[PDB]
Structure 1
Amino acid sequence: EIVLTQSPATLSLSPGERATLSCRASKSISKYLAWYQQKPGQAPRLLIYSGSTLQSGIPARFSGSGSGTDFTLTISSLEPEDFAVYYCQQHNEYPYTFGQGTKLEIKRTVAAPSVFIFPPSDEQLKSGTASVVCLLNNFYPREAKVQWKVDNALQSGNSQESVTEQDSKDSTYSLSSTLTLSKADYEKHKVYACEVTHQGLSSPVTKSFNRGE
Protein backbone atom coordinates (compact mmCIF):
# COMPACT_ATOMS: atom_id res chain seq x y z
CA GLU A 1 0.00 0.00 0.00
CA ILE A 2 2.51 2.69 1.13
CA VAL A 3 5.06 2.38 -1.68
CA LEU A 4 8.75 2.77 -0.94
CA THR A 5 11.07 3.85 -3.74
CA GLN A 6 14.83 3.50 -3.17
CA SER A 7 17.47 5.46 -5.09
CA PRO A 8 19.88 4.84 -6.74
CA ALA A 9 19.32 1.19 -7.71
CA THR A 10 23.07 0.52 -7.75
CA LEU A 11 26.08 2.41 -6.40
CA SER A 12 29.85 1.93 -6.66
CA LEU A 13 32.29 3.81 -4.42
CA SER A 14 35.83 3.55 -3.06
CA PRO A 15 37.00 2.77 0.48
CA GLY A 16 36.77 6.01 2.48
CA GLU A 17 33.85 7.63 0.63
CA ARG A 18 30.30 8.38 1.80
CA ALA A 19 27.45 6.40 0.33
CA THR A 20 24.18 8.36 0.18
CA LEU A 21 20.98 6.31 -0.24
CA SER A 22 17.52 7.77 -0.62
CA CYS A 23 14.18 6.25 0.19
CA ARG A 24 10.91 7.95 -0.79
CA ALA A 25 7.50 7.17 0.76
CA SER A 26 4.42 7.71 -1.38
CA LYS A 27 2.53 9.09 1.64
CA SER A 28 3.82 10.53 4.95
CA ILE A 29 5.24 8.00 7.43
CA SER A 30 6.42 10.56 9.98
CA LYS A 31 9.77 9.34 11.37
CA TYR A 32 8.99 5.62 11.19
CA LEU A 33 11.46 4.22 8.68
CA ALA A 34 14.04 1.50 9.25
CA TRP A 35 17.13 0.54 7.28
CA TYR A 36 18.68 -2.93 6.88
CA GLN A 37 21.90 -4.20 5.41
CA GLN A 38 21.84 -7.56 3.66
CA LYS A 39 24.92 -9.51 2.64
CA PRO A 40 24.54 -12.34 0.00
CA GLY A 41 22.96 -15.46 1.60
CA GLN A 42 22.46 -13.96 5.00
CA ALA A 43 19.59 -12.41 6.91
CA PRO A 44 19.14 -8.62 6.86
CA ARG A 45 20.94 -6.77 9.65
CA LEU A 46 19.02 -3.81 11.09
CA LEU A 47 21.01 -0.57 10.92
CA ILE A 48 18.64 2.27 11.85
CA TYR A 49 15.06 2.51 13.06
CA SER A 50 12.67 5.50 13.42
CA GLY A 51 14.60 7.38 10.75
CA SER A 52 17.66 8.13 12.75
CA THR A 53 18.15 5.91 15.82
CA LEU A 54 21.34 3.92 15.38
CA GLN A 55 20.69 0.38 16.53
CA SER A 56 22.39 -1.83 19.02
CA GLY A 57 25.35 -3.50 17.26
CA ILE A 58 26.05 -0.96 14.53
CA PRO A 59 29.09 1.33 14.11
CA ALA A 60 28.58 5.12 14.13
CA ARG A 61 29.65 5.56 10.50
CA PHE A 62 26.07 4.68 9.59
CA SER A 63 23.51 7.47 10.09
CA GLY A 64 20.01 8.43 9.00
CA SER A 65 17.92 11.57 8.54
CA GLY A 66 14.54 12.56 7.14
CA SER A 67 10.88 12.41 8.01
CA GLY A 68 7.47 12.23 6.40
CA THR A 69 8.17 11.56 2.71
CA ASP A 70 11.96 11.54 2.36
CA PHE A 71 14.73 9.62 4.01
CA THR A 72 18.45 9.24 3.57
CA LEU A 73 20.82 6.61 4.84
CA THR A 74 24.48 7.70 4.96
CA ILE A 75 27.50 5.36 5.19
CA SER A 76 30.65 7.30 6.00
CA SER A 77 33.96 5.49 5.81
CA LEU A 78 33.32 2.87 3.26
CA GLU A 79 35.21 -0.26 4.14
CA PRO A 80 35.21 -3.42 1.97
CA GLU A 81 32.69 -5.00 4.46
CA ASP A 82 30.08 -2.40 3.44
CA PHE A 83 29.24 -4.35 0.27
CA ALA A 84 25.56 -5.27 0.43
CA VAL A 85 22.01 -4.66 -0.60
CA TYR A 86 20.37 -1.96 1.56
CA TYR A 87 16.62 -1.92 2.20
CA CYS A 88 14.38 0.68 3.79
CA GLN A 89 11.09 -0.40 5.43
CA GLN A 90 8.22 1.75 6.86
CA HIS A 91 7.12 0.75 10.37
CA ASN A 92 4.34 3.26 10.58
CA GLU A 93 1.31 1.69 8.98
CA TYR A 94 -0.39 -1.60 8.09
CA PRO A 95 0.51 -3.16 5.73
CA TYR A 96 4.30 -3.06 6.36
CA THR A 97 6.35 -2.61 3.23
CA PHE A 98 9.92 -2.62 1.93
CA GLY A 99 11.82 -0.74 -0.80
CA GLN A 100 13.37 -2.71 -3.69
CA GLY A 101 16.91 -2.01 -2.46
CA THR A 102 20.16 -0.31 -3.42
CA LYS A 103 23.16 -2.53 -4.24
CA LEU A 104 26.50 -1.06 -3.13
CA GLU A 105 29.75 -2.19 -4.71
CA ILE A 106 33.07 -1.29 -3.05
CA LYS A 107 35.84 -0.27 -5.52
CA ARG A 108 39.41 -1.61 -5.24
CA THR A 109 42.56 -1.36 -7.37
CA VAL A 110 42.33 -3.37 -10.62
CA ALA A 111 43.27 -7.05 -10.20
CA ALA A 112 43.71 -9.56 -13.00
CA PRO A 113 42.25 -13.00 -12.36
CA SER A 114 44.51 -15.96 -11.76
CA VAL A 115 43.08 -18.49 -14.20
CA PHE A 116 43.08 -22.27 -13.86
CA ILE A 117 41.54 -25.01 -16.04
CA PHE A 118 40.07 -28.39 -15.09
CA PRO A 119 39.46 -31.22 -17.54
CA PRO A 120 36.50 -33.45 -16.79
CA SER A 121 37.27 -36.14 -14.23
CA ASP A 122 37.48 -39.62 -15.76
CA GLU A 123 34.66 -40.47 -13.33
CA GLN A 124 32.10 -38.13 -14.96
CA LEU A 125 32.98 -39.37 -18.45
CA LYS A 126 31.88 -42.89 -17.42
CA SER A 127 28.32 -41.51 -17.28
CA GLY A 128 28.42 -39.91 -20.74
CA THR A 129 28.93 -36.21 -19.94
CA ALA A 130 32.03 -33.99 -19.86
CA SER A 131 32.32 -30.73 -17.90
CA VAL A 132 35.32 -28.58 -18.76
CA VAL A 133 35.83 -25.94 -16.11
CA CYS A 134 37.66 -22.64 -16.38
CA LEU A 135 38.15 -20.72 -13.11
CA LEU A 136 38.89 -16.97 -12.92
CA ASN A 137 39.93 -16.17 -9.38
CA ASN A 138 39.89 -12.90 -7.44
CA PHE A 139 39.47 -10.20 -10.07
CA TYR A 140 38.34 -6.55 -10.22
CA PRO A 141 36.39 -5.09 -11.91
CA ARG A 142 33.59 -7.60 -12.50
CA GLU A 143 33.69 -7.35 -16.30
CA ALA A 144 35.60 -10.21 -17.86
CA LYS A 145 35.14 -12.06 -21.14
CA VAL A 146 35.76 -15.80 -21.27
CA GLN A 147 36.11 -17.57 -24.60
CA TRP A 148 36.22 -21.38 -25.09
CA LYS A 149 38.34 -22.92 -27.86
CA VAL A 150 38.12 -26.61 -28.87
CA ASP A 151 40.91 -27.39 -31.36
CA ASN A 152 41.44 -23.66 -32.16
CA ALA A 153 37.69 -23.24 -32.94
CA LEU A 154 35.26 -20.90 -31.08
CA GLN A 155 32.36 -22.37 -29.03
CA SER A 156 28.77 -21.17 -28.66
CA GLY A 157 25.72 -21.98 -26.50
CA ASN A 158 27.63 -24.79 -24.69
CA SER A 159 29.21 -22.85 -21.79
CA GLN A 160 27.65 -21.42 -18.62
CA GLU A 161 29.05 -18.76 -16.31
CA SER A 162 28.50 -18.23 -12.62
CA VAL A 163 29.91 -15.30 -10.60
CA THR A 164 30.33 -15.05 -6.85
CA GLU A 165 29.07 -12.04 -4.92
CA GLN A 166 31.79 -9.47 -4.25
CA ASP A 167 34.06 -10.66 -1.42
CA SER A 168 33.73 -8.65 1.82
CA LYS A 169 37.44 -8.69 2.75
CA ASP A 170 39.29 -7.95 -0.50
CA SER A 171 36.44 -6.75 -2.78
CA THR A 172 37.35 -9.21 -5.56
CA TYR A 173 34.96 -11.29 -7.68
CA SER A 174 35.48 -14.85 -8.86
CA LEU A 175 34.01 -16.52 -11.94
CA SER A 176 33.42 -20.05 -13.15
CA SER A 177 33.03 -20.90 -16.79
CA THR A 178 31.77 -24.42 -17.59
CA LEU A 179 31.89 -26.12 -20.98
CA THR A 180 29.52 -29.09 -21.25
CA LEU A 181 29.94 -31.65 -24.08
CA SER A 182 28.83 -35.25 -24.59
CA LYS A 183 31.49 -37.94 -23.97
CA ALA A 184 31.40 -38.73 -27.70
CA ASP A 185 32.20 -35.13 -28.59
CA TYR A 186 34.79 -34.77 -25.84
CA GLU A 187 37.03 -37.62 -27.08
CA LYS A 188 36.52 -36.44 -30.67
CA HIS A 189 38.88 -33.47 -29.96
CA LYS A 190 42.40 -32.76 -28.67
CA VAL A 191 43.15 -29.29 -27.31
CA TYR A 192 40.96 -27.53 -24.80
CA ALA A 193 41.66 -23.86 -24.18
CA CYS A 194 39.96 -21.17 -22.12
CA GLU A 195 40.69 -17.60 -23.33
CA VAL A 196 40.39 -14.82 -20.71
CA THR A 197 40.19 -11.10 -21.55
CA HIS A 198 40.18 -8.72 -18.54
CA GLN A 199 41.18 -5.08 -17.91
CA GLY A 200 43.99 -6.18 -15.55
CA LEU A 201 45.57 -8.05 -18.47
CA SER A 202 47.70 -6.18 -21.01
CA SER A 203 46.88 -9.06 -23.37
CA PRO A 204 44.29 -11.90 -23.27
CA VAL A 205 45.65 -14.92 -21.29
CA THR A 206 44.99 -18.55 -22.32
CA LYS A 207 44.90 -21.69 -20.22
CA SER A 208 44.83 -25.02 -22.03
CA PHE A 209 45.43 -28.79 -21.95
CA ASN A 210 45.80 -31.75 -24.35
CA ARG A 211 43.01 -34.33 -23.96
CA GLY A 212 43.87 -37.11 -21.55
CA GLU A 213 47.57 -36.44 -20.83
Structure 2
Amino acid sequence: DIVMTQTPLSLSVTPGQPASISCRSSRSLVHSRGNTYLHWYLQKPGQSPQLLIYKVSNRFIGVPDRFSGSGSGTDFTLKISRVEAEDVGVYYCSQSTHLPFTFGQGTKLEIKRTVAAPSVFIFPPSDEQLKSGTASVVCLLNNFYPREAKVQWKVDNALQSGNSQESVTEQDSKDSTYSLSSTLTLSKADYEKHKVYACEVTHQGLSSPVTKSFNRGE
Protein backbone atom coordinates (compact mmCIF):
# COMPACT_ATOMS: atom_id res chain seq x y z
CA ASP A 1 0.00 0.00 0.00
CA ILE A 2 1.31 3.48 -1.08
CA VAL A 3 2.83 5.32 1.93
CA MET A 4 2.13 9.09 1.91
CA THR A 5 4.92 10.91 3.90
CA GLN A 6 3.86 14.37 4.95
CA THR A 7 6.40 17.00 6.31
CA PRO A 8 6.50 18.94 8.66
CA LEU A 9 4.08 17.19 11.14
CA SER A 10 3.36 20.56 12.90
CA LEU A 11 3.91 24.19 11.95
CA SER A 12 3.60 27.60 13.70
CA VAL A 13 2.96 30.52 11.29
CA THR A 14 2.54 34.33 11.75
CA PRO A 15 -0.63 35.94 10.24
CA GLY A 16 0.13 37.20 6.70
CA GLN A 17 3.15 34.87 6.31
CA PRO A 18 3.34 31.93 3.83
CA ALA A 19 3.32 28.19 4.71
CA SER A 20 4.36 25.11 2.78
CA ILE A 21 3.46 21.40 3.36
CA SER A 22 5.12 18.66 1.42
CA CYS A 23 3.84 15.17 0.51
CA ARG A 24 6.06 12.32 -0.74
CA SER A 25 4.64 8.96 -1.97
CA SER A 26 6.38 5.52 -1.99
CA ARG A 27 5.42 5.09 -5.71
CA SER A 28 4.40 7.33 -8.64
CA LEU A 29 0.86 8.79 -8.52
CA VAL A 30 0.77 9.33 -12.34
CA HIS A 31 -2.36 7.46 -13.53
CA SER A 32 -2.33 8.38 -17.25
CA ARG A 33 -1.46 11.46 -19.38
CA GLY A 34 -2.62 14.67 -17.60
CA ASN A 35 -3.94 12.62 -14.63
CA THR A 36 -2.23 12.56 -11.22
CA TYR A 37 -4.64 11.68 -8.39
CA LEU A 38 -3.04 13.62 -5.48
CA HIS A 39 -5.37 15.87 -3.45
CA TRP A 40 -5.18 18.14 -0.39
CA TYR A 41 -7.73 18.38 2.42
CA LEU A 42 -8.13 20.70 5.38
CA GLN A 43 -9.95 19.28 8.44
CA LYS A 44 -10.94 22.06 10.96
CA PRO A 45 -11.48 20.76 14.57
CA GLY A 46 -14.53 18.51 14.99
CA GLN A 47 -15.40 18.87 11.26
CA SER A 48 -15.24 16.48 8.28
CA PRO A 49 -12.26 16.78 5.83
CA GLN A 50 -12.91 19.45 3.15
CA LEU A 51 -11.26 19.30 -0.32
CA LEU A 52 -9.01 22.16 -1.13
CA ILE A 53 -6.97 20.90 -4.09
CA TYR A 54 -7.49 17.87 -6.37
CA LYS A 55 -5.32 16.31 -9.03
CA VAL A 56 -2.15 18.20 -7.91
CA SER A 57 -3.20 21.84 -8.63
CA ASN A 58 -6.90 22.12 -9.29
CA ARG A 59 -8.66 24.32 -6.70
CA PHE A 60 -12.09 23.28 -5.52
CA ILE A 61 -15.18 25.52 -5.48
CA GLY A 62 -14.60 28.58 -3.30
CA VAL A 63 -10.93 27.65 -2.59
CA PRO A 64 -8.87 30.93 -2.86
CA ASP A 65 -5.79 31.47 -5.07
CA ARG A 66 -3.65 31.64 -1.78
CA PHE A 67 -3.89 27.79 -1.77
CA SER A 68 -1.87 26.36 -4.56
CA GLY A 69 -0.63 22.82 -5.07
CA SER A 70 2.28 21.64 -7.30
CA GLY A 71 4.54 18.66 -7.86
CA SER A 72 4.67 15.52 -10.01
CA GLY A 73 5.53 11.79 -9.79
CA THR A 74 6.25 11.14 -6.07
CA ASP A 75 6.91 14.63 -4.67
CA PHE A 76 4.19 17.24 -4.17
CA THR A 77 3.67 20.41 -2.21
CA LEU A 78 0.79 22.50 -0.88
CA LYS A 79 1.44 26.15 -0.41
CA ILE A 80 -0.47 28.82 1.43
CA SER A 81 0.54 32.32 0.65
CA ARG A 82 -0.59 34.82 3.37
CA VAL A 83 -1.76 32.26 6.12
CA GLU A 84 -4.99 33.52 7.78
CA ALA A 85 -6.70 32.71 11.16
CA GLU A 86 -9.33 30.52 9.27
CA ASP A 87 -6.46 28.21 8.01
CA VAL A 88 -5.96 26.53 11.43
CA GLY A 89 -6.70 22.82 11.23
CA VAL A 90 -5.02 19.55 10.11
CA TYR A 91 -3.92 19.18 6.45
CA TYR A 92 -3.97 15.83 4.72
CA CYS A 93 -2.61 14.74 1.36
CA SER A 94 -4.55 11.96 -0.44
CA GLN A 95 -3.80 9.57 -3.25
CA SER A 96 -6.56 7.94 -5.41
CA THR A 97 -4.31 6.46 -8.17
CA HIS A 98 -3.97 2.94 -6.72
CA LEU A 99 -6.17 0.92 -4.40
CA PRO A 100 -6.27 1.03 -1.40
CA PHE A 101 -6.61 4.81 -1.35
CA THR A 102 -4.17 6.32 1.17
CA PHE A 103 -3.69 9.53 3.18
CA GLY A 104 -0.73 11.37 4.73
CA GLN A 105 -0.44 11.31 8.57
CA GLY A 106 -1.59 14.97 8.61
CA THR A 107 0.04 18.33 9.40
CA LYS A 108 -1.30 20.53 12.22
CA LEU A 109 -1.22 24.21 11.33
CA GLU A 110 -1.03 26.53 14.31
CA ILE A 111 -1.20 30.34 14.01
CA LYS A 112 1.39 32.43 15.96
CA ARG A 113 -0.68 35.51 16.96
CA THR A 114 0.15 38.17 19.64
CA VAL A 115 0.28 37.33 23.39
CA ALA A 116 -3.29 37.44 24.80
CA ALA A 117 -3.94 37.26 28.55
CA PRO A 118 -6.81 35.04 29.73
CA SER A 119 -10.04 36.44 31.17
CA VAL A 120 -10.54 34.35 34.39
CA PHE A 121 -13.94 33.21 35.74
CA ILE A 122 -14.77 30.83 38.62
CA PHE A 123 -17.99 28.90 39.07
CA PRO A 124 -19.17 27.26 42.34
CA PRO A 125 -21.10 23.90 42.26
CA SER A 126 -24.89 24.17 41.68
CA ASP A 127 -27.24 23.35 44.61
CA GLU A 128 -28.84 20.72 42.25
CA GLN A 129 -25.46 18.91 41.85
CA LEU A 130 -24.72 19.18 45.61
CA LYS A 131 -27.98 17.19 46.23
CA SER A 132 -26.23 14.27 44.37
CA GLY A 133 -23.32 14.07 46.87
CA THR A 134 -20.55 15.70 44.73
CA ALA A 135 -19.26 19.24 44.09
CA SER A 136 -17.54 20.40 40.88
CA VAL A 137 -15.86 23.81 41.05
CA VAL A 138 -14.96 25.19 37.58
CA CYS A 139 -12.29 27.73 36.62
CA LEU A 140 -12.47 29.12 33.04
CA LEU A 141 -9.50 30.76 31.25
CA ASN A 142 -11.05 32.46 28.20
CA ASN A 143 -9.35 33.44 24.88
CA PHE A 144 -5.59 33.38 25.64
CA TYR A 145 -2.30 32.97 23.75
CA PRO A 146 0.06 31.04 23.99
CA ARG A 147 -1.49 27.71 25.18
CA GLU A 148 0.91 27.45 28.14
CA ALA A 149 -0.72 28.42 31.44
CA LYS A 150 -0.61 27.22 35.06
CA VAL A 151 -3.86 26.85 37.02
CA GLN A 152 -3.56 26.33 40.81
CA TRP A 153 -6.54 25.45 43.00
CA LYS A 154 -6.53 26.98 46.55
CA VAL A 155 -9.24 26.03 49.10
CA ASP A 156 -9.03 28.25 52.28
CA ASN A 157 -5.53 29.28 50.93
CA ALA A 158 -4.44 25.57 50.95
CA LEU A 159 -2.91 24.49 47.59
CA GLN A 160 -4.69 21.51 45.98
CA SER A 161 -3.11 18.51 44.23
CA GLY A 162 -4.52 15.43 42.45
CA ASN A 163 -8.25 16.47 42.64
CA SER A 164 -8.55 18.58 39.41
CA GLN A 165 -8.74 17.92 35.61
CA GLU A 166 -8.06 20.27 32.75
CA SER A 167 -9.36 20.57 29.21
CA VAL A 168 -8.16 22.88 26.44
CA THR A 169 -9.99 23.79 23.20
CA GLU A 170 -8.23 23.73 19.84
CA GLN A 171 -6.98 27.09 18.36
CA ASP A 172 -9.90 29.42 17.49
CA SER A 173 -10.51 30.02 13.73
CA LYS A 174 -11.28 33.76 14.23
CA ASP A 175 -8.99 35.18 17.01
CA SER A 176 -6.34 32.31 17.04
CA THR A 177 -6.58 31.98 20.86
CA TYR A 178 -7.21 29.05 23.23
CA SER A 179 -9.63 28.52 26.12
CA LEU A 180 -9.04 26.24 29.11
CA SER A 181 -11.23 24.81 31.88
CA SER A 182 -10.06 23.35 35.21
CA THR A 183 -12.49 21.30 37.29
CA LEU A 184 -11.97 20.78 40.99
CA THR A 185 -14.02 17.79 42.23
CA LEU A 186 -14.81 17.31 45.97
CA SER A 187 -17.53 15.33 47.87
CA LYS A 188 -20.56 17.38 49.14
CA ALA A 189 -19.25 16.84 52.76
CA ASP A 190 -15.65 18.00 51.99
CA TYR A 191 -16.98 20.97 49.98
CA GLU A 192 -19.05 22.14 52.95
CA LYS A 193 -15.94 22.14 55.28
CA HIS A 194 -14.51 25.30 53.59
CA LYS A 195 -15.33 28.99 52.85
CA VAL A 196 -12.99 30.30 50.11
CA TYR A 197 -12.51 28.57 46.77
CA ALA A 198 -9.94 30.24 44.57
CA CYS A 199 -8.29 29.65 41.23
CA GLU A 200 -4.77 31.09 40.60
CA VAL A 201 -3.78 31.66 36.93
CA THR A 202 -0.17 32.07 35.77
CA HIS A 203 0.30 33.08 32.04
CA GLN A 204 2.88 34.93 29.84
CA GLY A 205 0.27 37.68 29.21
CA LEU A 206 -0.15 38.45 32.95
CA SER A 207 2.41 40.65 34.83
CA SER A 208 1.45 38.95 38.17
CA PRO A 209 -0.82 35.85 38.71
CA VAL A 210 -4.58 36.52 38.60
CA THR A 211 -6.88 35.05 41.30
CA LYS A 212 -10.64 34.67 41.18
CA SER A 213 -12.48 33.42 44.27
CA PHE A 214 -15.85 32.94 45.94
CA ASN A 215 -17.16 32.50 49.50
CA ARG A 216 -19.31 29.32 49.78
CA GLY A 217 -22.81 30.12 51.10
CA GLU A 218 -23.30 33.37 49.09
Please tell me the TM-score bracket, short chain as reference.
over 0.9
- The two structures have a TM-score, normalised by structure 2, of 0.95
Structure 2 residue 132 is matched with structure 1 residue 115 = no
Q: Secondary structure at the match of 1:124?
A: helix
Rounded to whole Å, the distance in 2 between the matches of 1:118 and 1:176 is 11
How far apart are 1:56 and its partner, in Å? 2.0
Rounded to whole Å, the distance in 1 between the matches of 2:61 and 2:155 is 56
- The two structures have a TM-score, normalised by structure 1, of 0.97
CA RMSD of aligned residues (A): 0.9
Unaligned runs of 5+ in 1: none
Rounded to whole Å, the distance in 2 between the matches of 1:105 and 1:37 is 13
Match of 2:104 in 1: 99
Matched AA of 2:164 = S
Q: Secondary structure at the match of 1:81?
A: helix
Q: Secondary structure at the match of 1:87?
A: strand
Identify which of 58, 63, 73 aligns with 2:68.
Answer: 63
Unaligned runs of 5+ in 2: 31-35
Structure 2 residue 203 is matched with structure 1 residue 198 = yes
Structure 2 residue 112 is matched with structure 1 residue 146 = no
Matched AA of 1:57 = G
Rounded to whole Å, the distance in 2 between the matches of 1:37 and 1:19 is 14
How far apart are 1:111 and its partner, in Å? 0.6
Q: Secondary structure at the match of 2:77?
A: strand
Task: Flag as ranges the 4+ runs of structure 1 deviating above 4 A.
Answer: none
Q: Secondary structure at the match of 2:86?
A: helix
Matched AA of 2:184 = L
TM alignment of 1:31-110, pairs within 5 A: 31-110=36-115
Rounded to whole Å, the distance in 1 between the matches of 2:194 and 2:24 is 58
Rounded to whole Å, the distance in 2 between the matches of 1:67 and 1:91 is 14
Count, aligned residues: 213
Rounded to whole Å, the distance in 2 between the matches of 1:208 and 1:177 is 14
Matched AA of 1:11 = L
